C-alpha cells in the first residue's frame, strides 16, 4: 500500500516533460537541458541515478561521488593550487595590510591569487549512463506513469505497450552499497531487453574496456587526467532461471530474452581516498574490480526481497522522522494532479489552496530526500553543487560542467547543510565534518604560503595543534585550498570560519561529547590562525577596530578593502563558538581569556611578523570584543564595507566600485550575523532594524518583490525567517517555487544547483522553529539556544502540524496550530537539558506543561519586551506536552 506515500509523478517520459524554463550556461545541448529539468534522482550517498522513464530506450544517468579529475597525478607538481611565488610565505599579505593600515581604502591584491591550472583543479564528472533497450517497434503506450516515491526512496515507471504491462523500479541501497533495477513483464516470455553502460565520452581515459563475463558486464579504466581508477558492474539476474541471458551482439552489452522478471544489481567504485597528499587507496585495478564484484555478488545472494526490505527500512528510518501537514493534497487525493501540472498551476496562479500546500510541502520534503540520496554517514564526500547528480563532463575546471559541480564555500556548500540538523538528519552531516577535517593538512600549506602560518610538520600535527589552515571559495576532492585565479571571487579565507558554523552546529544540536572534541579541535586552530596571522588594527577607512585585513565581499564591490562585514561577522561567530566549545570542555588550554588590557594595539608586529609585545592580551574574548562587525549606514542599512555611507555609496556620495546598481546582488555576505549566525537576533535586536532595511533593499524594488537565483532566494527565505516576519518569508517561498524550480523540482540558478533545494527545507524549518537565540529575563538570567515555537508563521498557513524537528540542546519538537496559534507543543528531551520554550504564536505564559499523566512545574520568565519562556527541568527520553491553560 503506497497510498500514504509522498510522490513526485508524471504522466509522460522525461523526453516529453516540459523543459522550457531557463537552461543556463553549459546546457545549450537539448538533451543535457532535458536531463536537468525532467529526470528523477535517487542515490545512496555514494552512487546515484537520474531516471528518464523512456518507454523503449530507457535511460538512467549514472554517477559516483568520487569520480573527480584534478589533484595529484594531474601534473608532477600538484600542490593544491598554491602559488608560492605570489604568496611569499605571508609577505605579500603583510605588505598589503600595511598599506591598508596606512589609510588606503583598497589595494592591488593581484598576488593574493592561485589555482591557475584548470587541469590540476579538475572537477566532478558524470560517470555515464545505464541504457535498457526494450527494442520496441513503436513507443505507443497506455496507462503510463513515472514517479519518485520519496517515502520509500525509489523511482517507478509503468506502462502498457502491446497488451503487456511493463514495470521498472530503481533504488540505491546504502546498507548493501548497490543500485537495483527491478524489471517485470505481465505475461511470460514478454520481457526482452539489452543492458549497456557507456561512460561519458567527454572525459579522457586510459585503457577502458567493456567486458561481459557471466551474467555481469564490467566497464573498467583509468582517468587520463589523473590516473584515478574506475570500475562499474551490472549483474543481470533472471528470475529463477527462466529466460535467455546472452552476451550482446556488440560485446558491450547483455541481452535478456523471454522473461518474466529480472533484477539488475549495479555497483561502482574508484580508488579515490580522502587522504592527503596522495588521495588514493593504493589499490590496483584488479583489487578495485574484486571489491566491486563482491558488492553485486552479495546483493545477488541476499536477493531482491531482502535487499529491497533493508533499503526501505534504512531509507524510511530517516525520511519518516519529520511529518508535515499544512492541508496538502497528494497523489491519492480525488482530483490529484501530476507534479509538472501542479508546478504550472502554481506559476499560473490557478492552483487551489490544497494544491499550493502540496507543492510547498513536496519541495520541503524533497530537500530532506535529496540529503538522504547525496550525503550519508559513510559517504566519502559531502554533497557538491549538484548533490551527486550530473550529466555533464570535461577534464578541466571552469569547463563543460558549471562551476565544476564543485564544493563552493562562499555560500553554496554551507546552504547544503543548513537543514541537516533542524530537519532531523543530524548523522548525515558526518561527510561535511570529515571534509572540513580533510582541509586541515592541505590548508596548512595555504596558510603558510599566503599568511605565513607554518605548522612544523603539517602532515602529522593533530588538528587543533597546528598554526592554522586556510581555504577559500572554490574547493575540490583534492585539497584545492589555494585562493582562486581572480581575486574578485577567488579570495575568501572566512569561507573556513563559515563552514565551521555548519560543523559546530553538529555539536549544538546533539550535545555529543565526541563531536565536542572534534569541533573544538577545528575551532581552536582556525581561531589561533585568525588571531595570530589574519587580524590587524584597521586603518582610517575602517575606523577603530581589528579587521581581517585584505578582503573581498562575495561577490561584489571593491577588491582588497580593510576587512568587511562578511569576514568580521564570520570571525565574530567563530570566536563566539570557540569560546562556547572551550567552556564546555573546561577551557583546558586557557584560551578564552578576558577583556582586561584589551586594545587593537595589542596586535602590533615587528618586521618578522612576531608580536611586538609577546605578552599582550590577544585572547579569544579580547579579539571578539574588538571586531565591532556591525555598523549602520546613512540609508539605515547594515554597511557591507566600513567606508560605506549611504547604500552602495561612499561618504562623499560617489558610487562604490563594483556594487550591483539595482541593489539586487544575489549574495548578502554582510547579513550572515542575522542568518545563519547569532550576532543579530530577535532578543539581541540593536541591529535588527538595519538588517531588515538591508534585506528590503536586497529583495524589493519599492514594494515589488524581485526574483533572483534559486540559492539567493533560499538564503533570503532563511534571513527573513530569523526576523520573525512570516508573511514576507512566505512571499519568498512562493517566489522560489514560481521562478527557480524545474518540473522535477530541482532548484536552479540557472542552471540546476542543489543548494536552493536545501535552503528551502531550512527556511521552512526556521519559520516553524528557531533555536539559535539567547533570551535574557528581566533579572538578567540568560537562556542560551532556547526553543522558539512558531517564530515566523505565515498568515497563509492558518492551521497545521509538524513533528520531528530538532532544536539546539537536542530537543525533538512537534507543534499543532489553529487560527494562527499553537494548540499543542510536543517536546522530547533527548539529553535531559533544562527546557526553555518560547511560543511566538500564542505566548508561552498562556500554556502549561505535562509529562504524560502528570503536571510539570514550569517557571514563567519574561524579558523587557513582554515575551515569556516556560522554563523546566527535563529527563532524557521524556516527551513533554505543552497545551493552553485549562480550567
Ligand X SMILES: OC[C@H]1O[C@@H](O[C@H]2[C@H](O)[C@@H](O)[C@@H](O)O[C@@H]2CO)[C@H](O)[C@@H](O)[C@H]1O
Q: Per-residue x/- mask for ligand FUC, residues 477 to 516, rule CB under 6 A?
A: ------------x---------------------------
Closest listed residue to residue 528, CA positions, set 472, 459, 582, 481: 582
Binding residues for ligand FUC, total number by CB under 6 A: 11
If the CB atoms of residues 356 and 665 are measured against ligand FUC, the closer one turns out to be 665
Show contacts with ligand FUC in window 381-410 (CB under 6 A): 385, 403, 408
Contact in structure between 467 and 490 (CB atoms under 8 Å):
no
If the CB atoms of residues 709 and 787 are measured against ligand X, the closer one turns out to be 709
User: Least distance (Å) from ligand X to the CB of residue 749?
Assistant: 9
Contact in structure between 71 and 478 (CB atoms under 8 Å):
yes
Which SS3 state, helix, strand or coil, does residue 15 take?
helix
Q: Does 269 bind Ca ion (CB under 5 A)?
A: no
Which SS3 state, helix, strand or coil, does residue 151 take?
coil
Report what 365 binds from ligand X, ligand FUC, Ca ion, none; CB cut-off 5-8 Å by kind: none
From residue 336, give the alpha-carbon distance in Å to each of 12, 353, 355, 743: 16, 13, 9, 16
Alpha carbon distance 453, 472 (integer Å): 16
Terminal C-alpha separation, the chain: 43
If the CB atoms of residues 364 and 711 are measured against ligand FUC, the closer one turns out to be 711
Report what 412 binds from ligand X, Ca ion, ligand FUC, none; CB cut-off 5-8 Å by kind: ligand FUC
Bridge partners (DSSP) of residue 222 are 206, 229
Q: Does 766 bind Ca ion (CB under 5 A)?
A: no
Contact residue for Ca ion among 362, 381, 411, 535 (CB under 5 A): 381
Q: Which residues of this protein are in contact with ligand X, per CB under 6 A?
A: 25, 398, 403, 473-474, 489, 555
User: Least distance (Å) from Ca ion to the CB of residue 116?
Assistant: 28
Contact in structure between 716 and 695 (CB atoms under 8 Å):
yes
Show contacts with Ca ion in window 677-716 (CB under 5 A): 678
SS (H, E, C) 489-541: HHCCCCHHHHHHHHHHHHHHHHCCHHHHHHHHHHHHHHHHHHHHHHCEECCHH
Report what 474 binds from ligand FUC, ligand X, Ca ion, none; CB cut-off 5-8 Å by kind: ligand X
Backbone angles phi, psi at 330, to 5 degrees: -145, -170
Starting at the earlier edge strand, list the strands of the sheet with 811-818: 323-325, 800-807, 811-818, 821-829, 878-884, 847-851, 854-855
Contact residue for ligand FUC among 555, 567, 766, 777 (CB under 6 A): 555
If the CB atoms of residues 640 and 678 are measured against Ca ion, the closer one turns out to be 678
Bridge partners (DSSP) of residue 159 are 166
User: Least distance (Å) from ligand FUC to the CB of residue 487?
Assistant: 14
Contact residue for Ca ion among 33, 151, 379, 718 (CB under 5 A): 379
If the CB atoms of residues 25 and 189 are measured against ligand X, the closer one turns out to be 25
If the CB atoms of residues 712 and 882 are measured against ligand FUC, the closer one turns out to be 712
Report what 385 binds from ligand FUC, ligand X, Ca ion, none; CB cut-off 5-8 Å by kind: ligand FUC
If the CB atoms of residues 490 and 809 are measured against ligand FUC, the closer one turns out to be 490
From residue 19, give the alpha-carbon distance in Å to each of 33, 60, 157: 7, 18, 20
User: Least distance (Å) from ligand FUC to the CB of residue 316?
Assistant: 32
If the CB atoms of residues 82 and 173 are measured against ligand X, the closer one turns out to be 82
Report what 25 binds from Ca ion, ligand X, ligand FUC, none; CB cut-off 5-8 Å by kind: ligand X
Alpha carbon distance 618, 686 (integer Å): 27
Q: Look up residue 553 and give its three cell numbers.
A: 565581499
If the CB atoms of residues 17 and 564 are measured against ligand FUC, the closer one turns out to be 564
Report what 65 binds from Ca ion, ligand FUC, ligand X, none; CB cut-off 5-8 Å by kind: Ca ion
User: Least distance (Å) from ligand FUC to the CB of residue 665?
Assistant: 9
Q: Does 555 bind Ca ion (CB under 5 A)?
A: no
Alpha carbon distance 794, 786 (integer Å): 21
Alpha carbon distance 876, 851 (integer Å): 12
From residue 400, give the alpha-carbon distance in Å to each of 371, 403, 435: 25, 9, 25
Going by the DSSP 8-state scheme, the letter that residue 656 receives in this structure is P
Going by the DSSP 8-state scheme, the letter that residue 794 receives in this structure is -
User: Least distance (Å) from ligand FUC to the CB of residue 668?
Assistant: 11
User: Least distance (Å) from ligand FUC to the CB of residue 648?
Assistant: 18
Q: Give contact residues for ligand FUC (rule: CB under 6 A).
A: 385, 403, 408, 412, 489, 555, 666, 709, 711, 749, 753
Q: Give contact residues for Ca ion (rule: CB under 5 A).
A: 65, 379, 381, 678
Amino acid at each position: 500500500d503506497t497510498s500514504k506515500d509522498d510522490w513526485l509523478w508524471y504522466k509522460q517520459p522525461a523526453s516529453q516533460t516540459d523543459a522550457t524554463a531557463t537552461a543556463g550556461g553549459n546546457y545549450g545541448n537539448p538533451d543535457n537541458n532535458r536531463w536537468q529539468q525532467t529526470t528523477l534522482p535517487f542515490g545512496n550517498g555514494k552512487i546515484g541515478g537520474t531516471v528518464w522513464g523512456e518507454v523503449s530506450r530507457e535511460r538512467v544517468t549514472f554517477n559516483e561521488e568520487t569520480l573527480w579529475t584534478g589533484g595529484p597525478g594531474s601534473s608532477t607538481s600538484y600542490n593544491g593550487g598554491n602559488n608560492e611565488t605570489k604568496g611569499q610565505n605571508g609577505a605579500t599579505l603583510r605588505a598589503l595590510n600595511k598599506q591598508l593600515a596606512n589609510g588606503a581604502e583598497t589595494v592591488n591584491p593581484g598576488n593574493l591569487t592561485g589555482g591557475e591550472n584548470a587541469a590540476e583543479q579538475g572537477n566532478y564528472l558524470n560517470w555515464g549512463d545505464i541504457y535498457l533497450d526494450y527494442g520496441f517497434n513503436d513507443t505507443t503506450v497506455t496507462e503510463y506513469r513515472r514517479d519518485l516515491n520519496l517515502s520509500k526512496g525509489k523511482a517507478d515507471v509503468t506502462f502498457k505497450h502491446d497488451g503487456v504491462t511493463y514495470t521498472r523500479e530503481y533504488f540505491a541501497s546504502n546498507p548493501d552499497n548497490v543500485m537495483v533495477a527491478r524489471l517485470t513483464a505481465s505475461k511470460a516470455g514478454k520481457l526482452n531487453f539489452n543492458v549497456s553502460m557507456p561512460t561519458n565520452t567527454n572525459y579522457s581515459k586510459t585503457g577502458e574496456t567493456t567486458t561481459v563475463k557471466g551474467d555481469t558486464l564490467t566497464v573498467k579504466g583509468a582517468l587520463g587526467n589523473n590516473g584515478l581508477l574506475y570500475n562499474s558492474q551490472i549483474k543481470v539476474v533472471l528470475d529463477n532461471g527462466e529466460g535467455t541471458l546472452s552476451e550482446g551482439s556488440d560485446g558491450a552489452s547483455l541481452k535478456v530474452s523471454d522473461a518474466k522478471a529480472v533484477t539488475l544489481y549495479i555497483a561502482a567504485a574508484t580508488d579515490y581516498k580522502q587522504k592527503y597528499p596522495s588521495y588514493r587507496t593504493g589499490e590496483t585495478a584488479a583489487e578495485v574490480n574484486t571489491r566491486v564484484a563482491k558488492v553485486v555478488q552479495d546483493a545477488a545472494n541476499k536477493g531482491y526481497t531482502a535487499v529491497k526490505k533493508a533499503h526501505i527500512d534504512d531509507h524510511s528510518a530517516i525520511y519518516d522522522r519529520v511529518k508535515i501537514d499544512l492541508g496538502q493534497s497528494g497523489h491519492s487525493s480525488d482530483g490529484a494532479v501530476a507534479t509538472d501540472a501542479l508546478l504550472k498551476a502554481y506559476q499560473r496562479g490557478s492552483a487551489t489552496t490544497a494544491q499550493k500546500r502540496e507543492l510547498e510541502t513536496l519541495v520541503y520534503k524533497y530537500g530532506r530526500y535529496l540529503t538522504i540520496g547525496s550525503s550519508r554517514e559513510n559517504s566519502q564526500l559531502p554533497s557538491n553543487l549538484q548533490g551527486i547528480w550530473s550529466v555533464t563532463a570535461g577534464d578541466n575546471a571552469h569547463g563543460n560542467t558549471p562551476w565544476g559541480s564543485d564544493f563552493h564555500m562562499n555560500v553554496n556548500l554551507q546552504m547544503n547543510y543548513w537543514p541537516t540538523y533542524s530537519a532531523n538528519m543530524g548523522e548525515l552531516a558526518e561527510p561535511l565534518i570529515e571534509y572540513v577535517e580533510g582541509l586541515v593538512k592541505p590548508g596548512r600549506v595555504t596558510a603558510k604560503v599566503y599568511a605565513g602560518a607554518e605548522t612544523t610538520n603539517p602532515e602529522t600535527t593533530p588538528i587543533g595543534e597546528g598554526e592554522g589552515y586556510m581555504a577559500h571559495t572554490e574547493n575540490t576532492a583534492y585539497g584545492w585550498t589555494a585562493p582562486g585565479q581572480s581575486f574578485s571571487w577567488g579570495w575568501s579565507p572566512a569561507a573556513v570560519p563559515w563552514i565551521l558554523q555548519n560543523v559546530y552546529e553538529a555539536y549544538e544540536y546533539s550535545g555529543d561529547p565526541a563531536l565536542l572534541d572534534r569541533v573544538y579541535a577545528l575551532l581552536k586552530e582556525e581561531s589561533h590562525f585568525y588571531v595570530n596571522y589574519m587580524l590587524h588594527k584597521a586603518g582610517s577607512s575602517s575606523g577603530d577596530r581589528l579587521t581581517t585585513g585584505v578582503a573581498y565581499s562575495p561577490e561584489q564591490g571593491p577588491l582588497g578593502t580593510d576587512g568587511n562585514t562578511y569576514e568580521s561577522s564570520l570571525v565574530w561567530q567563530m570566536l563566539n563558538d570557540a569560546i562556547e566549545a572551550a567552556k564546555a570542555k573546561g577551557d583546558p588550554d586557557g584560551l578564552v581569556g578576558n577583556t582586561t588590557d584589551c586594545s587593537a594595539d595589542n596586535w602590533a608586529k615587528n618586521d618578522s611578523g612576531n608580536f611586538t609585545d609577546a605578552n599582550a592580551n590577544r585572547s579569544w574574548s579580547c579579539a571578539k570584543s574588538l571586531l565591532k562587525p556591525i555598523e549602520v549606514g546613512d540609508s539605515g542599512q547594515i554597511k557591507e564595507w566600513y567606508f560605506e555611507g549611504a547604500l552602495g555609496k561612499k561618504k562623499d556620495g560617489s558610487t562604490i566600485s563594483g556594487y550591483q546598481a539595482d541593489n539586487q546582488h544575489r549574495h548578502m555576505s554582510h547579513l550572515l550575523g542575522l542568518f545563519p549566525g547569532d550576532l543579530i537576533t530577535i532578543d539581541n535586536s540593536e541591529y535588527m532594524d538595519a538588517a531588515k532595511t538591508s534585506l528590503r533593499y536586497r529583495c524589493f524594488k519599492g514594494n515589488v518583490l524581485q526574483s533572483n537565483t534559486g540559492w539567493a532566494i533560499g538564503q533570503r527565505i532563511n534571513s527573513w525567517a530569523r526576523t520573525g516576519d512570516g508573511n514576507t518569508t512566505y512571499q519568498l517561498v512562493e517566489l522560489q517555487l514560481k521562478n527557480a524550480m524545474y518540473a522535477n523540482l530541482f532548484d536552479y540558478h540557472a542552471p540546476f544547483q542543489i543548494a536552493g533545494n536545501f535552503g528551502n527545507t531550512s527556511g521552512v524549518d526556521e519559520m516553524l522553529l528557531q533555536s539559535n537565540s539567547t533570551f535574557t529575563d528581566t533579572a538578567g538570567k540568560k537562556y542560551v539556544n532556547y526553543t522558539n515555537i512558531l517564530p515566523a508563521l505565515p498568515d497563509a498557513w492558518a492551521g497545521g502540524s509538524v513533528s520531528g524537528l530538532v532544536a539546539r540542546g537536542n530537543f525533538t519538537v512537534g507543534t499543532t496550530w489553529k487560527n494562527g496559534k499553537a494548540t499543542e507543543v510536543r517536546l522530547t528531551s533527548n539529553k535531559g537539558k533544562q527546557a526553555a520554550v518560547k511560543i511566538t504564536a500564542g505566548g508561552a505564559q498562556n500554556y502549561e506543561v505535562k509529562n504524560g499523566d502528570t503536571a510539570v512545574n514550569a517557571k514563567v520568565v519574561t524579558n523587557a519586551d513582554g515575551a515569556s519562556l516556560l522554563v523546566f527541568d527535563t529527563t532524557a527520553g521524556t516527551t513533554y506536552t505543552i497545551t493552553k491553560k485549562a480550567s
